[PDB]
Structure 1
Amino acid sequence: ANPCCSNPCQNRGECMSTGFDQYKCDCTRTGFYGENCTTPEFLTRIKLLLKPTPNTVWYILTHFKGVWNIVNNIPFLRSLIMKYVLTSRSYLIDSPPTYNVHYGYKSWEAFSNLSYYTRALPPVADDCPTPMGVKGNKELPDSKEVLEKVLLRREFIPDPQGSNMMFAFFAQHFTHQFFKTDHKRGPGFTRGLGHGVDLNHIYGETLDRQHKLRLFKDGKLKYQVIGGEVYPPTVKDTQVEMIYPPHIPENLQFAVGQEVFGLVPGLMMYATIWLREHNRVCDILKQEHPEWGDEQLFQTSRLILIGETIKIVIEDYVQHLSGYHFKLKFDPELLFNQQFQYQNRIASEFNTLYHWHPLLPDTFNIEDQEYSFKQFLYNNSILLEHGLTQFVESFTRQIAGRVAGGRNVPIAVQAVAKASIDQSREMKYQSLNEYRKRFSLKPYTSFEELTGEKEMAAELKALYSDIDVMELYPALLVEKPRPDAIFGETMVELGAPFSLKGLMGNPICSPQYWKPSTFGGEVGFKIINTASIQSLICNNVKGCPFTSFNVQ
């Protein structure tokens, strides 16, 4: 019934009903006008014929290694490039946020209520004839069918970019501070009221949880010593709630910021690393400031670790999966003369695209042993023995799965992968081609153009019938990968704007915060600005083992 169900407004113009069967497009500040915001203005037609495709820009970024070697060694040139990639990725994101799962129009409820994941595209209205608006059948194809035919793993397909388990667990650990779905309320709801990098997965979301985790001495986090090694404290000791099956012994019920980090030893490994890092920074800050009390030591350390995180995420993590020869750089100052909002709201689609299930291996290989999922889940005794030591060394060695390309979702987590599809439909996501348009990408004209092959393309065409009906999440895992890349075009071009917004939108990146006294002076500032995944491990893991997000 809703006349806006067909999504008739193009180029990010907004649709509004004006009658029971009539609509209007608001073309304000789109660069276009006309009934559907499709006829371009003069300056717009100039930009459109000058803006290179994302695949072209990707090509330039991933080739000419010698040229980028010169550029990377020229500070003013490097900063200039990093500035551009920052600003253009940012303008793609609505900030302050607009829609959520219950509001396909701007409202104060949608803006103010921090319990919602925001939304990059409004939901399809409930009174639309089809799930995607007006196209397709009354029901989307059977999600079991999609899952089994084009997503499930026959045999392991390794990432050609060489991502390892250090990367995969880092991705899970890091993003689980802002992907905290409130399952009581629904998939479109979050428990992460910070909506970004606040390290609540280390420090707890609430003050009460934080204080239970605190030592209240020298700014430090509580911990225990097992075999001369430092590990998180137990549930019995701190009384903080953790999720654990009942058969788990008390001495292994480790207590950390995120309640669910006890379920994967890979998570607990990073939880331990960061706990050691915080207490390390406390020691440094106490050395510099003997006059400081516990509270200032703790807070400043936390601000420093927030900095380290953002540093490591941009210059190691995002650097690795980008495949760029250009050396990405964390430098807040690059935005000081730019128009930029120091705020973020985490989008539901950013949650959805991050369901990187095919990253997981068939078995978790730690030195001699090869563990199954059942052996690996809720099992921290694995962590203890092999250690922080062998865990880093082993996870650095083991290859991870390719995400795009199709048919690489491990069978164990098929329930989780089906859930991703079903919840996307529950939240009334628009089609793949809609999101591609929302992010300045050309819509696919066939399933073959999407997959880059024929077998899976034919399978999808039988299921969905029309390419404009194809859903975002399955397309992300079945999309044609870039040449020897882990990802297709859609994943990168959606993920990068969301990610950099989250990273740079942090208050510590704002001019009033980005100065040495915020971090206890030059020494604390230095810890931020020289952070790396390697130094993170080196300072806190015994023996300083080598590490990387890629297989050696």
Structure 2
Amino acid sequence: ANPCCSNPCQNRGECMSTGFDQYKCDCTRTGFYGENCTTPEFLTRIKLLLKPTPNTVHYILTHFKGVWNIVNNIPFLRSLIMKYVLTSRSYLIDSPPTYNVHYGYKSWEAFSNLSYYTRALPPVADDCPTPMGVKGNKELPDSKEVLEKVLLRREFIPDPQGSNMMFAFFAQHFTHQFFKTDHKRGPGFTRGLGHGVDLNHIYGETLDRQHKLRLFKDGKLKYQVIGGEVYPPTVKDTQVEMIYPPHIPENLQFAVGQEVFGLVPGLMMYATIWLREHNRVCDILKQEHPEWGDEQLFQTSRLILIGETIKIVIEDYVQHLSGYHFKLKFDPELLFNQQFQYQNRIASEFNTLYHWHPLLPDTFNIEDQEYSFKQFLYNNSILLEHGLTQFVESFTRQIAGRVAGGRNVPIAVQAVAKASIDQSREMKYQSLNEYRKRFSLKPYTSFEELTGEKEMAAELKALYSDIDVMELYPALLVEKPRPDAIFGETMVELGAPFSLKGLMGNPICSPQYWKPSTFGGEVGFKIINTASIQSLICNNVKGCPFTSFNVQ
């Protein structure tokens, strides 16, 4: 019914109805004009002729290693390239944000209501004849069939980039501070009102929760000591609400900032490490500032840990997953003379693409044990049994699964994968190809081009008929990986700009925050600027075990 149902406006032109059966494309600042914003301005043809494709740039970043070594060791040159990386990657995201699950046009409600995830692409209107707009059949193919045919794991496929369980659980722990769906309201709603890296998964989303978690001495968070080792306090001792099945002993219900972190020992491992890190930073600050009170010690340490998180995420975590030989750098100063908005709104599509469940193994191997999913979930006794040191050593050694490439979702979480499909449809996501165009990628012209093989493509052809009807979420998991890579093109090109905004958009990266006094002086500042996944583990885990995001 809506004349904009067919998504006729190209190159980010905006579609507006002008009657029951007519539309107008607003081509303002797109660089194109004409009825559908497809005629390039002269400068546009110049830009287009020059810009390399994402696969070309990926090739360059993953080759000429000898050259990247030269670059990485020349400070001013590394800075220069990172500066370019930053600006190149930061023009695709609407900031201030625009659409959401209930608004396919800009509105004050969509802007102002922080309970929604934002949307990179507006939803397919409710009165459109087909789920994707006007293409395809009345209903999309059975989600169970999609799941069973091309997503479910047959044999475990290891990640060729060598990602390990330290990587998988770091991804889970880190992202679950800003992916926190409010199931009461619906899949298009979030409980993470900070919309980014605020460390609410350590400190609590609300002030009441934070205060229940705090010791109110020396800036510290409450903790218990068990067999000489520091662990989170209990629900019983703190009244911090946590999600635990009823059969869990009171003494095993650890209470942390994020209420779902009792779900798996690997989340609780990271919760425990960051808890120790907070109190460690508290000791350092108290040493540097014997005149400070508890409140300032707490707040300053939180700012420092936010800093360390952003640092580690960029220079270790994103560094590893990218596969780049270029050494990414966390340096807010690089944006100070550039246009950039210090703010972020978490996109629904970012949440959706980040469902990296293929990472998980069939069993979790710690020391000489192999835990099934059933044994592993909600089982903090496993953490106490083995200890943090053994957990790190074991997770560092265990390979994670490949995410793109298809057929690698562990069956234990098949309901989760089905729900990602079903809820994408519920939220009226536009198709894979629309999202590809939205991120300046070439539309796939066949299912074989998407997968790079023939068997899964054939299954999908039979299911969807038209590549233009293929959905974003399953596509991300069946996409042809880059050579020996964990992800395909669509995953990287969508994930990167969302991730950048969540990290650099933090206020601590703004010029008035990014200075020593914000972090209690040069000592606190140095903690941020020297942070690494290895140092986080070395400072807080007995014996300073070697760790890394890849298997050795």
Judge same fold: TM > 0.5, yes or no.
Answer: yes
Q: CA deviation at 1:460?
A: 0.1
Q: How many residues align?
A: 552
Q: CA deviation at 1:465?
A: 0.3
| CA distance in 1: counterparts of 2:192 and 2:33, whole angstroms | 39
| CA distance in 2: counterparts of 1:29 and 1:300, whole angstroms | 42
| CA distance in 2: counterparts of 1:179 and 1:89, whole angstroms | 22
Deviation per CA, 1:463-512: give whole Å up to 9, x if none.
00000000000000000000000000000000000001100000000000
Deviation per CA, 1:407-460: give whole Å up to 9, x if none.
000000000000000000000000000000000000000000000000000000
Structure 2 match to 1:410: 410
| CA distance in 2: counterparts of 1:278 and 1:307, whole angstroms | 12
Two-structure CA RMSD over aligned residues (Å): 0.3
Q: CA deviation at 1:97?
A: 0.1
| CA distance in 1: counterparts of 2:84 and 2:421, whole angstroms | 35
Local SS of the residue matching 1:370: strand
| CA distance in 1: counterparts of 2:5 and 2:87, whole angstroms | 32
Structure 2 match to 1:248: 248
Local SS of the residue matching 1:49: helix
Q: CA deviation at 1:85?
A: 1.1
Output the TM-score relative to the length of structure 2: 1.00
Q: CA deviation at 1:354?
A: 0.2
Local SS of the residue matching 1:24: strand
Q: CA deviation at 1:385?
A: 1.3
For residues 381-396 of structure 1, the aligned pairs below 5 Å read 381-396=381-396
| CA distance in 1: counterparts of 2:259 and 2:57, whole angstroms | 41
Deviation per CA, 1:374-429: give whole Å up to 9, x if none.
00011001001111010000000000000000000000000000000000000000
Q: CA deviation at 1:13?
A: 0.5
| CA distance in 2: counterparts of 1:28 and 1:87, whole angstroms | 21
Structure 1 match to 2:358: 358
| Greater CA drift, 74-83 or 213-222 | 74-83
Local SS of the residue matching 2:24: strand
Deviation per CA, 1:510-548: give whole Å up to 9, x if none.
000000000000000000000000000000000000000
| CA distance in 2: counterparts of 1:499 and 1:376, whole angstroms | 30
| CA distance in 1: counterparts of 2:393 and 2:445, whole angstroms | 45
Deviation per CA, 1:32-70: give whole Å up to 9, x if none.
000000000011000000000000000000000110000
| CA distance in 1: counterparts of 2:99 and 2:112, whole angstroms | 11
| CA distance in 2: counterparts of 1:143 and 1:84, whole angstroms | 41
Structure 1 match to 2:56: 56
Deviation per CA, 1:84-139: give whole Å up to 9, x if none.
11112111100000000000000000000000000000000000000000000000
Deviating runs (4+, > 3 A) in structure 1?
none
| CA distance in 2: counterparts of 1:528 and 1:60, whole angstroms | 30
| CA distance in 2: counterparts of 1:183 and 1:83, whole angstroms | 39
Local SS of the residue matching 2:118: coil
Q: CA deviation at 1:249?
A: 0.4
| Greater CA drift, 76-85 or 469-478 | 76-85
Q: CA deviation at 1:76?
A: 1.1
| CA distance in 1: counterparts of 2:202 and 2:361, whole angstroms | 26
Q: CA deviation at 1:362?
A: 0.2
| CA distance in 2: counterparts of 1:387 and 1:13, whole angstroms | 55
| CA distance in 2: counterparts of 1:536 and 1:382, whole angstroms | 22
Q: CA deviation at 1:263?
A: 1.1
Deviation per CA, 1:286-333: give whole Å up to 9, x if none.
000000000000000000000000000000000000000000000000
Q: CA deviation at 1:221?
A: 0.3
Local SS of the residue matching 2:50: coil
Structure 2 match to 1:435: 435
Local SS of the residue matching 1:537: helix
Q: CA deviation at 1:207?
A: 0.2
Deviation per CA, 1:136-162: give whole Å up to 9, x if none.
000000000000000000000000000
Deviation per CA, 1:331-388: give whole Å up to 9, x if none.
0000000000000000000000000110000000001000000000110010011110
Q: CA deviation at 1:209?
A: 0.2
| CA distance in 1: counterparts of 2:458 and 2:486, whole angstroms | 23
Local SS of the residue matching 1:473: helix
Deviation per CA, 1:272-299: give whole Å up to 9, x if none.
0000000000000000000000000000
Identical residues among aligned pairs (%): 100
| CA distance in 2: counterparts of 1:219 and 1:104, whole angstroms | 45
Q: CA deviation at 1:75?
A: 1.0
| CA distance in 1: counterparts of 2:250 and 2:84, whole angstroms | 51
| CA distance in 2: counterparts of 1:125 and 1:84, whole angstroms | 38
1:238 aligns with 2:238: yes
Q: CA deviation at 1:26?
A: 0.2
| CA distance in 1: counterparts of 2:259 and 2:439, whole angstroms | 34
Local SS of the residue matching 1:401: coil
Local SS of the residue matching 1:11: coil
| CA distance in 2: counterparts of 1:90 and 1:351, whole angstroms | 19
Deviation per CA, 1:228-267: give whole Å up to 9, x if none.
0000000010011000011100110000000000010000
Local SS of the residue matching 1:15: strand
Which 5+ residue runs of structure 2 have no aligned equivalent? none
Local SS of the residue matching 2:230: strand
Local SS of the residue matching 2:16: strand
Local SS of the residue matching 2:15: strand
Output the TM-score relative to the length of structure 1: 1.00
| CA distance in 1: counterparts of 2:70 and 2:537, whole angstroms | 30
For residues 6-405 of structure 1, the aligned pairs below 5 Å read 6-405=6-405
Structure 2 match to 1:506: 506
1:456 aligns with 2:449: no
| CA distance in 1: counterparts of 2:541 and 2:87, whole angstroms | 37
| Greater CA drift, 221-230 or 78-87 | 78-87
Local SS of the residue matching 2:276: helix
| CA distance in 2: counterparts of 1:386 and 1:343, whole angstroms | 41
Local SS of the residue matching 2:473: helix
| CA distance in 1: counterparts of 2:336 and 2:263, whole angstroms | 41
Local SS of the residue matching 2:365: strand
